[PDB]
Amino acid sequence: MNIFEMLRIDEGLRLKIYKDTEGYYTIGIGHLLTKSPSLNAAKSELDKAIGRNTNGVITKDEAEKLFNQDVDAAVRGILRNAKLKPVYDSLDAVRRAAAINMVFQMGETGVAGFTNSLRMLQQKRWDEAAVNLAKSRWYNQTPNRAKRVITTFRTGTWDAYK
């Protein structure tokens, strides 16, 4: 298991524009297109992202290419973030995957806002961090995905995904 296979499981793959759990226009492997309610604003962003006139549909290759960029951007946001970086540096390889997952789903700013949980993860207080991570809108809105991520932080294994 690795970050890529983990995110592919959590986000699925869709080749046509769809709405995410929050209702936003998305495509591929969890690639948010826009927060705007306009399908046209969405199609426009899409064509801009791919470099061609797509009419809202992409190929698997195109989907995977956006995915590779998005994982890279996710890691880099973590490394550029003064709150995230130290946490990330402190973690083992499996737990690092869980942090990347959260950033990919909710953005750097969002993750950065989990102050208390970040402090607990840095201290390696696994059980306490898991309880604190669960007291969130995130867990309440996407409970199965959150549990998976949380279990990963608690255990340091890929069991939630096997």
Yes or no: say if 105 and 30 are a contact pair by the CB < 8 Å rule: yes
Quote the CA–CA distance of 46 and 112 in Å, as a whole number: 28
Of the candidate spans 42-50, 57-65, 92-100, 117-125, the one that interacts with Cl ion by CB under 5 A turns out to be 42-50
Residue 117 assigned to a binding site: yes
Report the C-alpha gap between 49 and 8 in whole angstroms. Answer: 20
Return the residue matching tokens 């096997």. 162
Q: Which two tokens stand for residue 57?
A: 């549909």
11 is catalytic: yes
Query: Is 49 among the residues that bind Cl ion (CB under 5 A)?
Result: yes
Question: Six-digit token pair at 28?
Answer: 């591929």
Nearer to Cl ion, 88 or 138 (CB): 138
Is 71 within 8 Å of 36 (Cβ atoms)? Answer: no
Which one of residues 34, 81, 142, 155 is an interface residue with Cl ion (CB under 5 A)? 142
- Residue 104 in marked binding region: yes
Residue 90 Cβ, how far from Cl ion at the closest point, in Å?
27
Is 127 in the active site?
Answer: no
81 is in an annotated binding site: no
Q: How far is the CB of 142 from Cl ion (least distance, A)?
A: 4
Residue 122 binds Cl ion, judged by CB under 5 A: no
Residues in the chain: 162
Using the rule CB under 5 A, is 145 a contact of Cl ion?
yes
The answer to whether the beta carbons of residues 3 and 97 sit under 8 Å apart is yes
Nearest approach, Cβ of residue 119 and Cl ion (Å): 26
- Residues at the binding site for substrate are 32, 104, 117, 132
Residue numbers in the known binding site are 32, 104, 117, 132
